[PDB]
Scaffold this motif. Structure first.
Motif, PDB file in Angstrom:
ATOM      1  N   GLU A 508       0.827  -1.200   0.000  1.00  0.00           N
ATOM      2  CA  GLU A 508       0.000   0.000   0.000  1.00  0.00           C
ATOM      3  C   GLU A 508       0.867   1.257   0.000  1.00  0.00           C
ATOM      4  O   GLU A 508       0.579   2.186  -0.740  1.00  0.00           O
ATOM      5  CB  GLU A 508      -0.944   0.010   1.210  1.00  0.00           C
ATOM      6  CG  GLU A 508      -1.914  -1.155   1.268  1.00  0.00           C
ATOM      7  CD  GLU A 508      -1.351  -2.436   1.843  1.00  0.00           C
ATOM      8  OE1 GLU A 508      -1.738  -3.521   1.354  1.00  0.00           O
ATOM      9  OE2 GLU A 508      -0.501  -2.359   2.758  1.00  0.00           O
ATOM     10  N   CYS A 509       1.949   1.265   0.797  1.00  0.00           N
ATOM     11  CA  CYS A 509       2.895   2.377   0.860  1.00  0.00           C
ATOM     12  C   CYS A 509       3.632   2.507  -0.459  1.00  0.00           C
ATOM     13  O   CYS A 509       3.791   3.612  -0.963  1.00  0.00           O
ATOM     14  CB  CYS A 509       3.888   2.187   2.004  1.00  0.00           C
ATOM     15  SG  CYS A 509       3.213   2.487   3.652  1.00  0.00           S
ATOM     16  N   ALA A 510       4.122   1.387  -0.998  1.00  0.00           N
ATOM     17  CA  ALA A 510       4.886   1.401  -2.233  1.00  0.00           C
ATOM     18  C   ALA A 510       4.073   1.928  -3.404  1.00  0.00           C
ATOM     19  O   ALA A 510       4.529   2.841  -4.085  1.00  0.00           O
ATOM     20  CB  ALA A 510       5.433   0.011  -2.531  1.00  0.00           C
ATOM     21  N   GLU A 511       2.852   1.405  -3.615  1.00  0.00           N
ATOM     22  CA  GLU A 511       2.016   1.836  -4.721  1.00  0.00           C
ATOM     23  C   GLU A 511       1.453   3.246  -4.538  1.00  0.00           C
ATOM     24  O   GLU A 511       1.114   3.891  -5.528  1.00  0.00           O
ATOM     25  CB  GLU A 511       0.917   0.816  -5.024  1.00  0.00           C
ATOM     26  CG  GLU A 511      -0.169   0.717  -3.974  1.00  0.00           C
ATOM     27  CD  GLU A 511      -1.230  -0.326  -4.273  1.00  0.00           C
ATOM     28  OE1 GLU A 511      -1.155  -0.981  -5.339  1.00  0.00           O
ATOM     29  OE2 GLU A 511      -2.140  -0.492  -3.429  1.00  0.00           O
ATOM     30  N   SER A 512       1.378   3.736  -3.290  1.00  0.00           N
ATOM     31  CA  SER A 512       0.942   5.099  -3.021  1.00  0.00           C
ATOM     32  C   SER A 512       2.030   6.086  -3.453  1.00  0.00           C
ATOM     33  O   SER A 512       1.718   7.139  -4.000  1.00  0.00           O
ATOM     34  CB  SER A 512       0.631   5.282  -1.544  1.00  0.00           C
ATOM     35  OG  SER A 512      -0.539   4.563  -1.195  1.00  0.00           O
ATOM     36  N   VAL A 513       3.302   5.738  -3.243  1.00  0.00           N
ATOM     37  CA  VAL A 513       4.425   6.570  -3.657  1.00  0.00           C
ATOM     38  C   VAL A 513       4.434   6.709  -5.184  1.00  0.00           C
ATOM     39  O   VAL A 513       4.572   7.817  -5.700  1.00  0.00           O
ATOM     40  CB  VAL A 513       5.756   5.982  -3.146  1.00  0.00           C
ATOM     41  CG1 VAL A 513       6.933   6.731  -3.732  1.00  0.00           C
ATOM     42  CG2 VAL A 513       5.825   6.014  -1.629  1.00  0.00           C
ATOM     43  N   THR A 514       4.262   5.591  -5.904  1.00  0.00           N
ATOM     44  CA  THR A 514       4.250   5.613  -7.366  1.00  0.00           C
ATOM     45  C   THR A 514       3.010   6.289  -7.930  1.00  0.00           C
ATOM     46  O   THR A 514       3.094   6.926  -8.980  1.00  0.00           O
ATOM     47  CB  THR A 514       4.462   4.216  -7.949  1.00  0.00           C
ATOM     48  OG1 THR A 514       3.383   3.364  -7.586  1.00  0.00           O
ATOM     49  CG2 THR A 514       5.734   3.605  -7.488  1.00  0.00           C
ATOM     50  N   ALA A 515       1.871   6.180  -7.234  1.00  0.00           N
ATOM     51  CA  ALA A 515       0.640   6.833  -7.674  1.00  0.00           C
ATOM     52  C   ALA A 515       0.758   8.335  -7.515  1.00  0.00           C
ATOM     53  O   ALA A 515       0.363   9.081  -8.408  1.00  0.00           O
ATOM     54  CB  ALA A 515      -0.550   6.303  -6.900  1.00  0.00           C
ATOM     55  N   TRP A 516       1.335   8.783  -6.394  1.00  0.00           N
ATOM     56  CA  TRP A 516       1.573  10.202  -6.168  1.00  0.00           C
ATOM     57  C   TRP A 516       2.580  10.722  -7.169  1.00  0.00           C
ATOM     58  O   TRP A 516       2.369  11.785  -7.727  1.00  0.00           O
ATOM     59  CB  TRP A 516       2.059  10.469  -4.744  1.00  0.00           C
ATOM     60  CG  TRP A 516       1.006  11.073  -3.873  1.00  0.00           C
ATOM     61  CD1 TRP A 516       0.290  12.207  -4.117  1.00  0.00           C
ATOM     62  CD2 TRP A 516       0.571  10.589  -2.595  1.00  0.00           C
ATOM     63  NE1 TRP A 516      -0.575  12.451  -3.078  1.00  0.00           N
ATOM     64  CE2 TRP A 516      -0.418  11.476  -2.127  1.00  0.00           C
ATOM     65  CE3 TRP A 516       0.916   9.489  -1.805  1.00  0.00           C
ATOM     66  CZ2 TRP A 516      -1.068  11.287  -0.916  1.00  0.00           C
ATOM     67  CZ3 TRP A 516       0.272   9.307  -0.600  1.00  0.00           C
ATOM     68  CH2 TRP A 516      -0.716  10.190  -0.174  1.00  0.00           C
ATOM     69  N   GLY A 517       3.622   9.939  -7.445  1.00  0.00           N
ATOM     70  CA  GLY A 517       4.639  10.279  -8.432  1.00  0.00           C
ATOM     71  C   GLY A 517       4.050  10.446  -9.816  1.00  0.00           C
ATOM     72  O   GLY A 517       4.355  11.424 -10.491  1.00  0.00           O
ATOM     73  N   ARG A 518       3.172   9.515 -10.236  1.00  0.00           N
ATOM     74  CA  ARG A 518       2.489   9.595 -11.528  1.00  0.00           C
ATOM     75  C   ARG A 518       1.630  10.840 -11.599  1.00  0.00           C
ATOM     76  O   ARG A 518       1.545  11.453 -12.654  1.00  0.00           O
ATOM     77  CB  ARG A 518       1.613   8.364 -11.774  1.00  0.00           C
ATOM     78  CG  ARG A 518       2.395   7.144 -12.195  1.00  0.00           C
ATOM     79  CD  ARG A 518       1.483   5.988 -12.516  1.00  0.00           C
ATOM     80  NE  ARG A 518       1.499   5.025 -11.419  1.00  0.00           N
ATOM     81  CZ  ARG A 518       0.480   4.788 -10.605  1.00  0.00           C
ATOM     82  NH1 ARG A 518      -0.659   5.444 -10.750  1.00  0.00           N
ATOM     83  NH2 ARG A 518       0.601   3.905  -9.621  1.00  0.00           N
ATOM     84  N   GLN A 519       0.990  11.224 -10.490  1.00  0.00           N
ATOM     85  CA  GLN A 519       0.154  12.412 -10.445  1.00  0.00           C
ATOM     86  C   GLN A 519       0.980  13.683 -10.597  1.00  0.00           C
ATOM     87  O   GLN A 519       0.634  14.519 -11.413  1.00  0.00           O
ATOM     88  CB  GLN A 519      -0.662  12.464  -9.145  1.00  0.00           C
ATOM     89  CG  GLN A 519      -1.515  13.715  -9.028  1.00  0.00           C
ATOM     90  CD  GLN A 519      -2.159  13.821  -7.689  1.00  0.00           C
ATOM     91  OE1 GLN A 519      -3.327  13.476  -7.521  1.00  0.00           O
ATOM     92  NE2 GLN A 519      -1.409  14.281  -6.701  1.00  0.00           N
ATOM     93  N   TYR A 520       2.055  13.837  -9.820  1.00  0.00           N
ATOM     94  CA  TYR A 520       2.872  15.041  -9.874  1.00  0.00           C
ATOM     95  C   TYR A 520       3.535  15.246 -11.233  1.00  0.00           C
ATOM     96  O   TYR A 520       3.572  16.374 -11.726  1.00  0.00           O
ATOM     97  CB  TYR A 520       3.896  15.066  -8.730  1.00  0.00           C
ATOM     98  CG  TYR A 520       3.261  15.280  -7.373  1.00  0.00           C
ATOM     99  CD1 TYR A 520       2.561  16.443  -7.087  1.00  0.00           C
ATOM    100  CD2 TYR A 520       3.375  14.329  -6.373  1.00  0.00           C
ATOM    101  CE1 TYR A 520       1.968  16.641  -5.849  1.00  0.00           C
ATOM    102  CE2 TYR A 520       2.781  14.513  -5.131  1.00  0.00           C
ATOM    103  CZ  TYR A 520       2.077  15.673  -4.872  1.00  0.00           C
ATOM    104  OH  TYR A 520       1.484  15.876  -3.651  1.00  0.00           O
TER     105      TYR A 520
END
Length: 721
Positions: A508-520
């Motif tokens: 959950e932490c790992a995919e949240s970092v990449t999801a936020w990264g994709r958004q920014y």
DNA sequence: CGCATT
DNA sequence: AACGGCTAATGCG
């Protein structure tokens, strides 16, 4: 300073040994009062009396629980009360831990597989390699007699070489007239002589290249065969050989066996990891290889022994040179993680972060989660979405700016408080929600990992500022290593979150970092396009290349700086977009494959380097890249390929530029033969092969971005229809 | 499935 | 010694 720790057993009780080097004096400190322990979660406190009577057996000896004590700790932030179970010996733990877990009243057990000596360093707050102590180093290497169908160490050791600040020397049992060669009567005398050298020099560090899997094992079998006590350890011990998965590892008690092989294997990327290739890549100087056949032939015929002795001398010399270059960096890594140089130099990225976290969790009275079992491990093999990769805009582009986020993933972790102890924590007044995945992270209190990541970034700035004030150039280099290692450690937390074997694993932490990264990255791209009229040519996980098609160089720079001021005011917390560089021209061939050139005319290439290639294919690719990037002439790059294919078809290319290198085998393809045997007057190379399998594949990927097919680059064979 | 980029 | 086998995903040959 502390070099390492271990334990010996005296009357069934463990005795910690702390190996230290204080004021140039080697010291061994003993601790007979450190008790091994594990934690146990019970559903009923009354059941502790039944758990205390649980017994097991190691090797005839009956294993018992010495004593229990209820302690208060934290588990992922939440307060917890757990039972601290003490034992006599650390080896009692593997013998009873399963029987304690299987007891009906036991919910689970914790911190049951932490090595005693490492548990000691953490619990006592001891940090290895800390201080201004200077370590004496000595490198060594061996040369052996090899025959094709023989067992390991069936042939004798021919030579033993060593090197330090005083120079390099070779010990052998045959007459070689070289000033650095010491001649003894037999192989036994040679080994005994080497032992006296190590004893007299008394080095704190023994440096080898693949000594973990060859040198020490060969010396051991030979000393057993000849009846020699191989006492290399400072306490009169022989080198301890251990099993590390499919390979081996050797420790010399009282000293530090620094094997450069695993270190360099992780630090740099090379086609081969022979001592010759490694030295040539790091120091830019050549080193000749002398093979086992040549050494056996030279020893039996007695001719050419000078060449073998020189090779033996160079092995020790270059190992000392490489050791001098990589050891201080490993010493700073050791001091950072808080584990011995021996372990850190042989440990992977996942193990290094785990040991750092284990220490920090103890400092914060935080109960550490267990390693995953086989069932849980299979559950954690599910992957998640990674970084965003934009399909590049075809064509040659002028005046390009590269903008990227300053430490995107660590910035996300700190800014959004991403941690397993803040994940979906109910009862908070403030949360940050990850886009797409929807995981919520409590913002009321700093999480365990984001708080450590914040302390790492703060400590890095405190070391960067200490560097500027340090007059001592040796200390400045040491601080530079620590500062670089902190950046590498901080950038390892994300990967660790998705590492299935990790104790603090959190998908959950790992995919949240990449999801936020994709958004920014995606929101910033639409922002620069819509509000500044930029064209985004290509983008990967944390950065993008942009330009204004009808704008001058100063105009693109100005607008890029204005965009940076704009989005940086909109970005939350530690997120920050930076001006990484400006490029005169560039082309983006496919995803992960591109090339740019700066105002100095330096060309940067990604994914185009590329395996065994002939010099004709490498030359034409470089010629094409130069014509496009320096001359801005794409039509010239196509003519070069047409010219090369025409010369190959008419057999005007010298055979020397057709050699393929893949021991390095140097061959040429005929109309399959080593290049030494190729004769242009008697034999003919395969023109079709070098056109279709060498030149065209290397160049096509580049010219495809401009709209040229493979047929647009072959020689115009004029068909007079 | 290797190797490279992030 | 009884822990380690090598942090992640995306994407081209």
């Amino acid at each position: 300073m502390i070099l390492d720790t271990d334990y010996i057993t005296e009357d069934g009780k463990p005795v910690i040994r702390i190996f230290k080097k204080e004021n140039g004096e080697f010291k061994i400190d003993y601790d007979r009062n450190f008790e091994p322990y594990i934690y146990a979660l019970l559903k009923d406190d009354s059941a502790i009396e039944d758990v205390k009577k649980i017994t097991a057996e190691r090797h005839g000896t009956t294993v018992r629980v010495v004593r229990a004590e209820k302690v208060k700790k934290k588990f992922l932030g939440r307060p917890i009360e757990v039972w601290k179970l003490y034992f006599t010996h650390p080896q009692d733990q593997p013998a009873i831990r399963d029987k304690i877990k299987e007891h009906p009243a036991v919910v689970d057990i914790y911190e049951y597989d932490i090595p005693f000596a490492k548990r000691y360093l953490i619990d006592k707050g001891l940090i290895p390699m800390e201080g201004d102590e200077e370590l004496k180093m000595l490198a060594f290497a061996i040369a052996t007699l090899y025959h094709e169908g023989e067992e390991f160490a069936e042939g004798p050791i021919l030579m033993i070489s060593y090197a330090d600040e005083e120079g390099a020397r070779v010990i052998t049992w045959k007459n070689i007239d070289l000033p650095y060669v010491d001649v003894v009567s037999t192989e036994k005398e040679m080994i005994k002589r080497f032992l006296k050298v190590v004893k007299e020099k008394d080095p704190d560090v023994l440096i080898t290249y693949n000594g973990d899997n060859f040198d020490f094992a060969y010396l051991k079998k030979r000393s057993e065969k000849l009846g020699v006590k191989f006492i290399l350890g400072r306490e009169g011990s022989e080198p301890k050989i251990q099993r590390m998965g499919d390979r081996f590892a050797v420790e010399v008690k009282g000293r530090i066996h620094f094997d450069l092989y695993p270190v360099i294997r992780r630090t740099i990327n090379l086609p081969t990891y022979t001592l010759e290739a490694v030295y040539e890549a790091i120091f830019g100087q050549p080193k000749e290889k002398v093979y086992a056949e040549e050494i056996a032939q030279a020893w039996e015929t007695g001719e050419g022994l000078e060449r073998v002795a020189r090779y033996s001398m160079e092995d020790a010399k270059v190992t000392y040179e490489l050791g001098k270059e990589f050891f201080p960096m490993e010493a700073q890594l050791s001091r950072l993680v808080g584990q011995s140089l021996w372990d850190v130099s042989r440990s992977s990225t996942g193990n290094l972060v785990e040991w750092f976290l284990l220490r920090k969790a103890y400092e914060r009275n935080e109960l550490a989660p267990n390693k995953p079992d086989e069932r849980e491990l299979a559950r954690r093999r599910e992957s998640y979405a990674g970084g965003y990769v934009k399909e590049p805009e075809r064509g040659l582009w002028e005046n390009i700016v590269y903008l990227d986020f300053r430490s995107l993933y660590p910035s996300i972790i700190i800014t959004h408080n991403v941690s397993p102890d803040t994940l979906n924590r109910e009862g908070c007044e403030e949360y940050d929600v990850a886009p797409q995945v929807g995981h919520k992270f409590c913002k009321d209190f700093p999480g365990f990992i984001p708080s450590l990541l914040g302390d790492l970034l703060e400590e890095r700035q405190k070391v960067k500022k200490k560097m500027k004030a340090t007059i001592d150039p040796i200390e400045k280099k040491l601080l530079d290593y620590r500062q670089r290692l902190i950046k590498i450690l901080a950038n390892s937390f994300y990967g660790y979150y998705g590492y299935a074997k990790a104790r603090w694993y959190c998908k959950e932490c790992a995919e949240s970092v990449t999801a936020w990264g994709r958004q920014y990255i995606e929101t910033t791209i639409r922002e620069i396009e819509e509000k500044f009229g930029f064209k985004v040519l290509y983008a990967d996980t944390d950065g993008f290349f942009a330009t204004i098609p009808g704008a001058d160089a100063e105009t693109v720079k100005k607008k890029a700086k204005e965009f940076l001021d704009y989005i940086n005011a909109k970005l939350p917390g530690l997120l920050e977009l930076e001006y990484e560089g400006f490029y005169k021209r560039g082309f983006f061939a496919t995803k992960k494959k591109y090339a740019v050139i700066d105002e100095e005319d330096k060309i940067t290439t990604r994914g185009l380097k590329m395996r065994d290639w002939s010099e004709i294919a490498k030359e034409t690719q470089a010629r094409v890249l130069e014509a496009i990037l320096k001359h801005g002439d794409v039509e010239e790059a196509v003519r070069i390929v047409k010219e090369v294919t025409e010369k190959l078809s008419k057999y005007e290319v010298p055979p020397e530029q057709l050699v393929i290198y893949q021991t390095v085998i140097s061959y040429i393809v005929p109309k399959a033969i080593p290049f030494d045997e190729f004769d242009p007057a008697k034999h003919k190379y395969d023109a079709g092969y070098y056109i279709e399998n060498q030149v065209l594949p290397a160049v096509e990927r580049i010219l495809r971005a401009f709209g040229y097919r493979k047929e647009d680059l072959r020689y115009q064979k004029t068909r007079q229809v």
